[PDB]
Design a protein around this ligand. Sequence first.
Ligand SMILES: C/C(=N\Nc1ncc[nH]1)c1ccc(NC(=O)c2cc3cccc([N+](=O)[O-])c3[nH]2)cc1
Ligand SMILES: C/C(=N\Nc1ncc[nH]1)c1ccc(NC(=O)c2cc3cccc([N+](=O)[O-])c3[nH]2)cc1
Lengths: 285, 285
Amino acid sequence: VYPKALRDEYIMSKTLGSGACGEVKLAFERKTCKKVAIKIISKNVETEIEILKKLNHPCIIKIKNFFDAEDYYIVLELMEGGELFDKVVGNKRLKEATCKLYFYQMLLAVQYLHENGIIHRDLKPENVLLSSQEEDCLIKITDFGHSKILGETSLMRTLCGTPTYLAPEVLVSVGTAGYNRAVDCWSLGVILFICLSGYPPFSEHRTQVSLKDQITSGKYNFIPEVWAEVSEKALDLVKKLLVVDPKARFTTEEALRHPWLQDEDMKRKFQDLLSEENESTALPQ
Amino acid sequence: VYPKALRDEYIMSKTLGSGACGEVKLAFERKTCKKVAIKIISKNVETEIEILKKLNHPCIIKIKNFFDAEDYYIVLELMEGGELFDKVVGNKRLKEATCKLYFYQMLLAVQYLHENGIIHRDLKPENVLLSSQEEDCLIKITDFGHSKILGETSLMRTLCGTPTYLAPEVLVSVGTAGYNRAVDCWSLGVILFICLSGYPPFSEHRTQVSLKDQITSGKYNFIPEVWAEVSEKALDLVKKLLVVDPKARFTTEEALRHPWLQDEDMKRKFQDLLSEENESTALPQ
Ligand SMILES: C/C(=N\Nc1ncc[nH]1)c1ccc(NC(=O)c2cc3cccc([N+](=O)[O-])c3[nH]2)cc1
Ligand SMILES: C/C(=N\Nc1ncc[nH]1)c1ccc(NC(=O)c2cc3cccc([N+](=O)[O-])c3[nH]2)cc1
């Protein structure tokens, strides 16, 4: 049975989805009679909730409520469009315009995370939720289970002293430290590749090369026929995100300044979708 | 003034030492009238205490009491010999025999840490305490302020899934992961070098090469005249600990099996010092 304090506030309904350690249910908030989603995580979820309670961005999910019972229950706003995964599965692909709208929002979300010292580390189509069943909708990033808070590092503390007794490998790691966030830009690149083409850049399908070797050489699977209808600009961005050196890789800022995203129609549609979502209280002047 | 709960149990006395964020005082336990040391740390000290409360080895300091007040107060057994630092400062050097006794204990201490999933990360002569003012004494490792508990890593969790969306640098790091403990073997190597020779292997004294370059090339400063009186075996061990590749570096096990430590007289003296320290309760048979 559901925990009493959850049943007290919400009437639980049908299943909307079902992940590995969890499941998502439709619920009705008793006070308002409005629909919510409730994510169940079976037994640092509590610290995932505190990360998410701090963040305030339209393209990142918000926690409405939380119950820590036999299992964890996370209440959030309904995302009726479901997962992005379902739009790209089975070689389905989105219009290039729709890819741009979605991707712009993802970049804004992840930029906001990185500005706020948070790395997601598990960006995938499964973790991108769509607001509605309409093509032109808002998206939100979810599932912060693998996320990490950037702070003062062990390395930074060590380098304040004299390294008389310090191991060489620690000194060598200074070259590449502080680029953990680049893992999210790589994932975005892979997500963009999938959205534009309907297939994954790295995959064991009809190849001899190991997945690991595909990834570390950066040699994505390019099938000209699938890509011919896609613009050069969109593929150019993909290529700047799938750079194997994390220091040369495009950051979210660099991506947002890329020609592919200098598209005032797309941006207008995003802004229009935002005000439509919003319900403010009346302003002076 | 000292906190009331500390004054309740102990009478505070003279200063024995004074580190950067702290100071060490002589105290008398009221109940027993026996001497203790009290380390003051001015404001994860509390988790350093919990690490130390779990460990049980004769060459690692034990916490007798702890007070978290305006400052932190850590009560421990008196180590009347003081810091090892003071035995090696000003180009002073220990007899080779004394170096072996001390170093054997350090290896046993650090082996015990690594077997128990703890890396110290700040092994230095300042953090080695001596039991008595006699040459042949027990030593204890102290100051676990930079220590880290080894556990299930982010990497291990990532590698359980398929790396479709995983950045190449994460896959590359698999080659060298799980060798963090080797930093302690390097420090031990530096400590041994200093003990045997009376001077530091890496240092900015009369050289053009930067400290960092000295360390990452592993090119220690070898002065033949200082070393001529030291055995080949002792220097051979030093060289196997000051290896720049952390995977080729000697572990504490490898060091303990080194010819330099196959010395039954040294080991006899260690065992004799242990039973002397100990006060058991009577045994059946
Ligand atoms: C925060 C979180 N997971 N965190 C963790 N932490 C460790 C494992 N999961 C979520 C994971 C998935 C979530 N999914 C949904 O809200 C959702 C999925 C879904 C599928 C179809 C339809 C809807 N819907 O709201 O209409 C849907 N909503 C929401 C939250
Ligand atoms: C646990 C710890 N420090 N932890 C942390 N954590 C962040 C910064 N320090 C210690 C650091 C140093 C300690 N030093 C001593 O007990 C000590 C130093 C010293 C010097 C001369 C004589 C004695 N003595 O006990 O007779 C001495 N005892 C003891 C504990």
